[PDB]
Symmetry: C3
Subunit: 118 residues, 3 copies
């Protein structure tokens, strides 16, 4: 479950894990560079959930790597996508195209317990 | 829960998170290249679940990076493993060896809610 | 839920997905190198759970990549963090600073089912 706003996120099919995120403008990412691509997307998830921004098969096969990608439940800004080209060729993203996906997960990172020495 | 077929996936121990995926043939991956390694593995997961193909500690320590890796519930093909060498040395994979693992997760990417302006 | 020990893990806020892991000593990571950074952190998670060591936004934006990162339920050692610099500049980590985060997830990688030919 989640709420979201923005024009750079597209409605998904039920059988896909994630929503596609769409590139805002044409941009070239030279070999070995890192670019921070802005989106207008903002999400609200339920307690103990988080958003995970990760790669698509079509851009991963060209060497685009999405790094970072953990969207905490308390974040109220716009998602930024951190992209590094680890391929051997310049990558050109075209306005509009899918270039990452957002998956919503639940974590259990809470309720610390006593260590069992057993 | 899942169903699977193929000879390149190995049965796992209960206390490990993922199934090992096995390299189909000897292959060298030069510094900075990307190779798409085919498996014969096919999986069926329950609704709102997905498979996650990600790295092993022994190959990550040599600079092998598994990229992409999100196996949607609707996919009915064979898993492909997208590998990039981000290390400083050529990597040689040997026929049979483990080189990635498949973990089954549930996502909550569905049931869009109204935004709370609160 | 989890138990943990060690001085290189910090208590978290409820609204963040993961615990920060803290660098043990000053260390420089040259462009394209890979370093294995030791922690003293040990965790115990419940059955069918795993720990996921992954990146922070502030270090991902400089080109630090955390690779591997899957901490199995049966592991009883100290977490090691595998770091590769995929940026274009040398990265300097300072003693004490956050440089990765640990998120606790549940997997469903178990209870193999019959394939449905339907
Ligand atoms: O790829 C990413 C990773 C993080 N964030 C946002 C959401 C996340 O909750 C916030 C974390 O920022 P921080 O707490 O200031 O940084 P750090 O992760 O370095 O602790 O940044 C993004 O938009 N994109
Ligand atoms: O590392 C990967 C990533 C994806 N896939 C398969 C499963 C996934 O469901 C499908 C997605 O292909 P697509 O929808 O055509 O591409 P995209 O992810 O670029 O939208 O590719 C793999 O086999 N290996
Ligand atoms: O980034 C990582 C990845 C793994 N591990 C630890 C926990 C994990 O359970 C164990 C796996 O070691 P292995 O079974 O010997 O290696 P492999 O993953 O190559 O099968 O290594 C770490 O400390 N850091
Ligand atoms: Sr798709
Ligand atoms: Sr193992
Ligand atoms: Sr933070």
């Amino acid at each position: 479950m989640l709420a979201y706003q923005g024009t750079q996120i597209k409605e998904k099919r039920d059988e896909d894990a994630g929503f596609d995120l769409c590139v805002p403008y044409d941009i070239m990412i030279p070999v070995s560079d890192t670019k921070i691509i802005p989106t207008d997307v903002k999400i609200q998830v339920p307690p103990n959930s988080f958003g995970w921004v990760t790669g698509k098969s079509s851009m991963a096969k060209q060497g685009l790597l999405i790094n970072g990608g953990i969207i905490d439940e308390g974040y109220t800004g716009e998602i930024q996508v951190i992209c590094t080209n680890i391929g051997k060729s310049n990558i050109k993203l075209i306005e509009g195209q899918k270039f990452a996906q957002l998956i919503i997960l639940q974590h259990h990172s809470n309720s610390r317990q006593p260590w069992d020495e057993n």
